[PDB]
Structure formats: C-alpha cells, structure tokens
Design a protein around this nucleic acid. Structure first.
Ligand SMILES: [Zn+2]
Lengths: 219, 329, 241, 331
DNA sequence: ACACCCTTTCATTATTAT
C-alpha cells in the first residue's frame, strides 16, 4: 500500500540517540497486544515480528522490515532533561536503625553503590515524527491507536502521543530505506546518509548481541 | 487504566534546575557580565509547544515537576505508607539489594545481568508493587507511567487538551524568592549571648578578625575559605495554583490500582519536589478521575471498592521474599 | 575490530589472566563485550562489585564476563581510556580540544573506537560499538551513547567560521555544553538567532546530540586546528603491565 | 505533625524585599523616570494564584514573611529560650563552629561532599534540635518544614482552603511609611546646646560649611554623603491575622515538644525586621496540633506528652551531639 | 571461605551563552 505515517505528540520526548524505527514501535505494540490477549507470560520474540509490514530480503539472508526510522521535523528547540537517581540516605538510615533494612555498612557513598546519587542528561525534542513504510493501512492504524507514547523513557510520562495519521503516498515519493539496513543491501536503497556501523537491523534494536555490520543513517 | 490527579499546591513548588543562573538585586534573570549578579537556582521548566492566540505553536516556558520526581514520590509514599508498615507488621526485613531495588529501582544487588524467565517476569509484573516500577538487576518494565506534574496553565494547553479551560492560570507562574544566610557571630551582642561558646569573647573576636581578614583578602583578590554570610535567590512556582498529574497503568491488576489509590489516599502528608526546609511542595489533592470517573472525596477516596479489596488481599499476602527474589534471584 | 573487546587482543595486546573458567554448553554472549563466549573461550563468572552502576548498558544477562572484557574492566584500562580513540595501530588521547578537532574533522580511516568520560572513571569501553565507517562515529560519553558525523561537523564549522568573518570578537551562533548537561545545550544564542538563516538554525537543530557535544569542544573562541593526539598505547600498556 | 498556628501582628510587618524600588511624594509605586523619586524598601511580597471574579484565577501580590525568616525565628527562639538555658545550666559548652552550626545551619561555607554515617544520621534526626534543623557540613535533611507567614486574606483563599472564611481580610494590605533622617546639628540653636561638641561653635560651623559645599557639589552634579536621607519603606498593616504552617515528617515526641516550647516562647520576639521601629511584634491567638485547638491565652495547655518528652530530652541535652554535628570530615 | 565493607588511587582538559 506504500504508506507514510506521521505522529504528533503533546508531551516532548527523549531525543533518540540511535534510530527510532517504526518497525520497532510496531513490534512493541504487537508485543503489548499479545500480552493483552495471551497473558503476561509470553515470549516477546514470538510476536515482535508479527507485523503488518512487508519484509525486504538482502541477497545473503539478512531480512529487515520495510519500515523506516522516524524523521523529526522540529517544532521546538532541542533542550536537555536532567534526571537523577538518588537512594534516600535519610530513609535508609531510619530503616537501618529500625532493622527493616539489613545493611551492615554504616556509610553511604554517592560516588558508587546502592546510594550513588547519579546525574544524567538526556536530550529532548518536540517534533513531528514521519516514517515511511510498506504495510497494510488497517493493521498499522490499530497498533498505533493502541499506542499512547513514543520514544524512550515512557515510564516518566515522556513523549505522550497526541495523535497520528496514516496515509498512502506514491511509490517513488516515500523513502522507507532511511533505516538500519544490512551491509549487503541493494545500492539503490543505500543513500549518502547510510554508513557502516555496529547496529541492529531488526527486532530489539538495543540488543547488542544482535548487532551486525549494518548500513544505517544518522538520527 | 488512567488516573488523573488534580492537585493544588498549598505552598510554593521548587524543583531545582541545573545550570549557572544569575540575577541582580532587581529581578533581572541572567544579566550580562559587568554588573552585580547573584546565584539563582530556578524551578524545573521545560519549553513546550502551545497554540494560544494563534493557530501555530510556539515554544513557551512551562514550569513543571518532572515525571521522575513524581514517580519516585509515588514510589516512596507507597513504601512509607503501605509497603514498609505491612512488612514491619509481618516482621520481614529487606537486604541491600531488595532495598535499593524497591526504594530506588537500582541494580546494585546484582550489578551483573540477572536473567528472568517469562513466567517469573509475568509473576513479578503481577506483584502489587514490583510490577509498577520493575527495576533492580532484572530491569523489569513497569506497568506504571507517572507523568510530569503539569500546572493548569495556558502554556500547558497542548499537554492538557480540552476540559481544563476553566481554572487555567496565565502569565508567569514563577517568582524569585530571596534567601540569605546570616553569620550568627556577627549577631552576638552580649556576654550572656556568648558564654555558651567555648572561649566566649576571645573565640568570638577571633571569628570576627578571621572574617575581616577573609573580607580584605577577597577585596584584594577582586582587584578560598567561604564565610557564613550568603545571599542568594531561588525561583519558585507560586502557591495556590492547580496541577494535573497523569498515572497510566499498562494493563494492571486490581491490586496495583489499589496500591496507587492508597498512595493518593496517604499522599497528603508528602511533599512534591523538595525545597524541604522551606516547606515547599505541600499540596492538597482536589480531584482524582479514575478512567475519567471522579472518585476523590474530601476524606480519601470513596468507591473503587474492588481495587481497595484487591490491594487489601495483596498486603495481607505481602512478604519480603518477593522483593528478595525480585532483586537477587 | 568487530566488537569493542577487540581493543584487548588486536590492539593493547594482552592475554587471559588464567584464573578464568573455560566456557561449556551452548554459547552465550558476554555481559559486557556483547561478544559470544563460544566453547573453549576463557570466561569469568561475573564478580562485579556493588559499585558497578552500568547494568543498563550490559549486553546480556548471561552473568559471564569474557576474558577480553576482564582486561577491559581493569582499572588502569578504565582510567587510561578516560579520553581515547582506539584505532587499529594504537590508542590516542582526545583530552585536548585540538585532539577532538582531529577526531571529529578528518578522522583516521581505521575501524576506531571513541571512548570519553563525563566523570573521573566509568565503565566506559565495553558498552560502545566500533565505528567501522569513518563518516558515522559511535562515541561513548559517560552514561550516554552518541553518534557524530564528521562531514556535518565540518559543515557546522564552516558556517561558524563564515558568520564570524570580519568580526574582531568571536561570537558563537549556538551554545553547546561540554558536559552536555545544561538546559541550553543546543539552545541557539541571540547573536546566532539574529545572524544565522532559518535553514541554518534548523540545520544546527538537526544535528545529533553527540554532534552538539562534540561541537562544544570545537565551537569555542580559540578555534582548534585538527592535531593528532599523542599515542598513549605504550603508556596504558605500561600501566596495565 | 501539621502545626497550624495563627498570630496577630499588633505592629507593622517589615520583611524587606531586596530590589531597587522608588516612590513619588504622592505614593505611586515605582514611577516613570524624570519625576522626583525617593527610595522605597517594599515588604516581602509573594505572587499567588487567587480567585478574582469567577474562575478568572490570577497571579496577584500577597505580602508575607518568608519561611526562611520564620524558620530562623523559630530556631533562634528555641535556641535562646530552650537549648542555650538548658546548655548553660549544666557544664556543656559549644565551639564557635558548633554555635555557627546550631544557628546558621553550617559552620562555614565550603562543605564536604563526603556524606555522614547512617548511625550518625539516625541519631541526629533523633535529636530534639538537630533533627529539626539539619544543617552541618554534611547536609542532613532536617525533619522540620517551616511555611511562610501568610496573611489570612482572600488572595490566599486557595492556600488556606476551609475554616478561614471568617476573619479574612480583603483589598489593600500594605502601607508606605516614610522616614526623614534629619541632620542633628541643624537642630543646634544655642551655645548651651553646643557645649558638648569639641570646639563648640567652630566645629558645628565647619560642618555647616562642609554641608553647603556638598549641597553645591550635588547641585553641580544634577545641573561623601550627608546625614539627610528622606526615604520610604512599605510595611504590612498591623492588626492582620496571619497563619503559619509548621510541619514535621514523622517527628520524635521531643522534637515537636521543642517546637511547642518555641511557640510558647514566641512572646516578645520580633518576626522579620525593623527592630528600631518595633516592627514584627505579634500575638499568637491560635495553635492547632493536627487540627485540635491547643492555644489558650495563658499558654498551650495541651499536648502534654510532647512537653514531658522535650523536658526529658533537654534534661539529657549535651554538647557532644552539637560538636560531632559541627565536625567536618574534611576539616 | 567469600561476600560485605572501609580506605587509596588514578586518569586530563578547559571556556562559558541565556
Ligand atoms: Zn564480553
């Protein structure tokens, strides 16, 4: 059907360090749908490839989904979210005195350990997310209608999806190739933005054990 | 499952921000160099998109409490008010890993990756507290999203959506509050004032002479011991305004919703985002819409009885060994 | 050169400590290297102490550290690579801003590996991928992974040099934070807002946050000419041995 | 522990807001430049979202006393009246850094980033005074939270909630008060008046010629600073009913007993500032201890267990905890 | 005897906008 999906989001999201693929989001949504039906005790890797998406086969194995990484049209200047992880030293001292916490150590350490006060700064963008793919319009729309947030750090409320629209587009108009592609991919599909890296082309894109020599663009 | 918590800050809100911010004696924030500037620590603000007065959207400064802060506040009020009293009632104790997992989501019990079977992932995700946040060595994804505390304000209108145009504040929601640290040795005035001090007058005069020596040293330096005289500023969010707070449970059990409901019941003692010595962050809960159904009364929550009963059967069935096997193995 | 732990055998040559076990059964990837520990490969049970805070960047839950990552987790190899690029010939330092100018403009053509510390010492090297192509660099900085494009870096430098021709005082278009920690990291300055075209403002917004962090070390007033860092692989080999 | 006390200031409140504020001779606040403006030191105003009209909630001024000022007032009250009398009546004595830690929170600037021990933190938050005001070089979290002093006003209606709709003020709440600062020797009129001055008429006339030269220099500058300084300061009007919300997160019995003893010794203390003008004098007409009214005119006359606990704990008060609180790990 | 805990210990730059 060769369609393009765009997403607008009320909350800003984490700016993705690597490529936010549409097939990754659809795989996580299908995994959540399978958890809704088949209970929480499922293998997520059984259903994360059960997508309304065509599959491109490289000449030597190495199939990828026909989706693309989300391109960002920035509505806002890029800002930075400071966040901290601090275990409450006062509450831990009270629990250690009362014996609810069984800690023999008398001194905390903010440099490292359980009481490491840690600071970390993640980039923030509010934008329009455009992804080009090859898939059935009806299947994607239901998955993205079950989608509430996009991007990372969704436990702290970031990147709440205000809405989305899924619309057909011409065959030469959409590049779905802006995507983590294998090294033996078709040179028609490979543009100047695609470069060699150690990256996942599929599935769990964070799984460093699944990273391959890939031709991927830059977010 | 969606929970909307509408709160009203009784005291100012101050979620401190990083960066070197400065302010003059007048309220000019970040003055250009070549003038007397003072250290300022502002509230947590992010730029958000808003369309007020025009169809297009512009980046406006919205002063919020982060979702990480409210997430840890929900976690800590469930621990302080439901989880730890129940565990003390059964007489159960927590280890270092179970405490750093339950109270901070930290993986310091097993820093090395801990493998969890999909079945035990399901059972711990069905736990009333563990499935809400996850964390620990397993890094379980929680059932719970805790959004940022958004002020009901025209800047937040894209985040708020419809249904909040009434009681919507406008303009600046912040104020620079000035705080100084007096040197109490300078306020010593009599022998009876100073005779609680070892040495008394001689030690007091030694402090005075050390302070004047440091002042002359700083004056000659301008043309590293810091004294107790300080004068600084902190931007707060003004009291009395209204905030929304989104808590979405991703396919929960009834006991997890009951635990969040017990948190909202006992949360009136807690404080939002710190500023602890100045009593900052004290609030009252004005409304709780449970999937859009208003459930908050003045005395806690009336109704929602299946969640309260499920969390009751959870907390009489709650022991620490679930937390130990969630942390260690 | 396929995994980051290949900076232990191919470069910064070292062997196993020989108090390590031999892997048995089905193969599992290392928790740190992301390298598959095959049968007959030396491995350790994961004896990470409680001060190890990099569980989020562990590749697998196998609790099995490969011997190459045991060498990678050595404290001399930790602090010795607090600012380093590891090419196929040797390790070079990127502590100076001229060294980061050489790293991010005209980089070496090897499959190198860029590690940098946002603090005193962090478990830094094993969690970051190797940069096989020159034009896409996987930088590790503190707790975050970063992606830097050298050609976009030179384009931003050409714009920044062009907008300050004929001016006595060098004024930056956009503030970038070296710690990548300020809220204004990525915020464009009012001189840059009044000077840069909107296409160039969207260009400086369109770069990756790793490129913003890199440009922070190379948008300062005393503009760094790209100069190679001194080779420190003898230094960290002596510190390791 | 949610102490809500209500006071009545019988004398104006001057919590001086830092700024560069001016006023005309008529009383217009911060006039446009060019007109003759006098210096004005405004009282501490907060902004507050309040209900003006019907649902037209707006950020309006409400002039208050800061919670830092009221916190230090409570601290110095329980110090000068409870802690130090019980610490002098026995042989205990503090170092100058320990006095500085007990009053200003810290013994110096430049704190140590090394934290404190868990047993240390538990014992210090179990202390009657240290757990209320946890300062020190290693920064404790003191369990006392002190609110700002809010006037019971319609502009604080969202803050106060319910139970204050009577005895609530409205409209203007402040007043500009002017001060002359007249030169003393202009009042000199006779040789009997000048006999205390060295030289008598000679030094007085010399200061007069110096004043004339300074006035001529100031006229030349318009078209060294004298003793004539006419100025203004905005105060809060007296007779107001104010509220003050002490709170304590899971207190020891002795700590809230110490807060009750400081509130019972709040008589003849000045709230913020204007010492010479007696500003800040107040009468407490209410104390509620988790909502129950525990203030008579004679004193508290309630909450007895808190008072016995703080009596037993200032009986056991010593300087050792203060000294090990003030002791820096770096120093 | 091994997990838990308390101290050294070592790495290198560098300017700053709002
Ligand atoms: Zn490994």
């Amino acid at each position: 059907v060769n369609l393009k999906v765009t997403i607008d989001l009320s909350n800003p999201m984490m700016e993705p360090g690597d490529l936010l693929h549409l097939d990754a989001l659809l795989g996580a949504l299908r995994v959540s749908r399978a958890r809704a039906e088949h209970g929480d005790a499922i293998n997520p890797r059984d259903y994360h490839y059960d997508l309304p998406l065509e599959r491109y086969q490289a000449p030597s194995g190495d199939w990828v989904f026909k989706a693309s990484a989300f391109k960002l049209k920035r509505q806002l200047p890029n800002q930075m979210w400071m966040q901290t992880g601090r275990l409450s030293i006062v509450e831990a001292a009270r629990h250690r005195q009362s014996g609810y916490l069984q800690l023999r150590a008398g001194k905390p350490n903010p440099a490292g350990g359980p009481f490491k006060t840690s600071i970390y700064h993640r980039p923030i963008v509010q934008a329009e997310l455009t992804a080009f793919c090859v898939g059935d319009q009806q299947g994607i729309e239901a998955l993205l209608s079950e989608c509430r947030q996009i991007g990372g750090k969704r436990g702290v409320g970031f990147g709440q999806v205000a809405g989305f629209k899924v619309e057909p587009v011409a065959e030469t108009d959409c590049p779905w190739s802006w995507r983590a592609l294998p090294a033996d991919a078709d040179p028609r599909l490979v543009t100047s933005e695609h470069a060699r890296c150690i990256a996942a082309i599929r599935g769990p894109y964070w799984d460093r054990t699944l990273h391959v020599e890939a031709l991927a663009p830059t977010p | 499952m969606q929970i909307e918590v509408t709160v009203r800050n009784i005291t100012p809100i101050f979620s401190a921000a990083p960066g070197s911010n400065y302010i003059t004696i007048d309220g000019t924030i970040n003055p250009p160099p070549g003038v007397s500037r003072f250290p300022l620590v502002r509230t947590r603000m992010m730029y958000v998109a808003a369309d007020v007065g025009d169809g297009v959207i512009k980046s406006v400064p919205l002063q919020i409490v982060p979702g990480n802060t409210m997430r840890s506040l929900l976690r800590r009020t469930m621990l302080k008010h439901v989880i730890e009293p129940a565990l003390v009632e059964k007489g159960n104790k927590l280890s270092i890993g179970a405490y750093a997992t339950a109270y901070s989501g930290n993986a310091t019990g097993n820093p090395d990756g801990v493998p969890s079977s999909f079945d035990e992932i399901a059972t711990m995700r069905a736990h009333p507290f563990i499935g809400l946040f996850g964390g620990g060595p397993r890094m379980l994804e929680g059932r719970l999203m805790v959004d940022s505390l958004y002020p009901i304000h025209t800047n937040a209108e894209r985040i708020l959506g419809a249904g909040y145009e009434n009681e919507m504040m406008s303009g600046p929601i912040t104020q620079v509050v000035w705080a100084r640290r007096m040197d109490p040795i300078l306020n010593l005035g009599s022998s009876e004032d100073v005779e609680v001090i070892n040495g008394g007058a001689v030690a007091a005069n030694g402090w005075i002479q050390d302070l004047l020596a440091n002042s002359k040293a700083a004056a000659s330096k301008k043309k590293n011991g810091r004294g107790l005289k300080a004068f600084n500023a902190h931007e707060v969010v003004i009291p009395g305004l209204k905030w929304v707070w989104r808590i979405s449970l991703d396919r929960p059990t009834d006991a997890q919703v009951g635990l969040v409901l017990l948190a909202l019941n006992k949360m009136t003692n807690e404080r939002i985002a710190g500023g602890h010595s100045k009593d900052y962050g004290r609030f009252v809960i004005d409304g709780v819409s449970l999937n859009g159904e208003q459930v908050w009364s003045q005395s806690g929550i009336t109704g929602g009885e299946q969640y309260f009963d499920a969390v009751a059967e959870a907390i009489d069935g709650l022991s620490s060994k679930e937390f130990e096997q969630f942390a260690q193995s | 050169m396929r995994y980051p732990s290949d900076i232990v055998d191919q470069v910064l040559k070292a062997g196993p400590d020989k108090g390590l076990l031999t892997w048995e059964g089905v193969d599992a990837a290392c928790s740190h290297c992301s390298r598959p520990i095959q049968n007959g490969d030396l491995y350790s049970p994961s004896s990470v102490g409680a001060f190890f805070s990099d569980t989020r960047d562990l590749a697998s839950t196998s609790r099995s550290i490969c011997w190459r990552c045991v060498v990678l987790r050595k404290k001399p190899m930790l602090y010795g690579l607090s600012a380093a690029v590891v090419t196929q010939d040797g390790i070079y330092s990127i502590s100076k801003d001229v060294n980061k100018a050489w790293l991010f403009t005209t980089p070496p053509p090897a499959p190198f590996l860029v590690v940098h510390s946002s603090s005193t010492m962090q478990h830094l090297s094993w969690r970051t991928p190797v940069t096989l192509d020159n034009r896409r660099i996987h930088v590790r900085y503190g707790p975050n992974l970063f992606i830097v494009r050298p050609e976009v870096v030179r384009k931003a430098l050409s714009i920044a040099d062009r907008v300050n021709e004929g001016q006595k005082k060098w004024v930056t278009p956009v503030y970038f934070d070296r710690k990548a920690a300020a809220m204004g990291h990525g915020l464009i300055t009012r001189a840059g807002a009044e000077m840069l075209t909107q296409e160039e403002q969207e260009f400086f917004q369109s770069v990756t946050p790793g490129e913003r962090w890199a440009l922070s070390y190379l948008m300062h007033s005393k503009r760094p000419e790209p100069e190679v860092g001194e080779c420190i692989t003898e230094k960290v080999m002596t510190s390791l041995n």
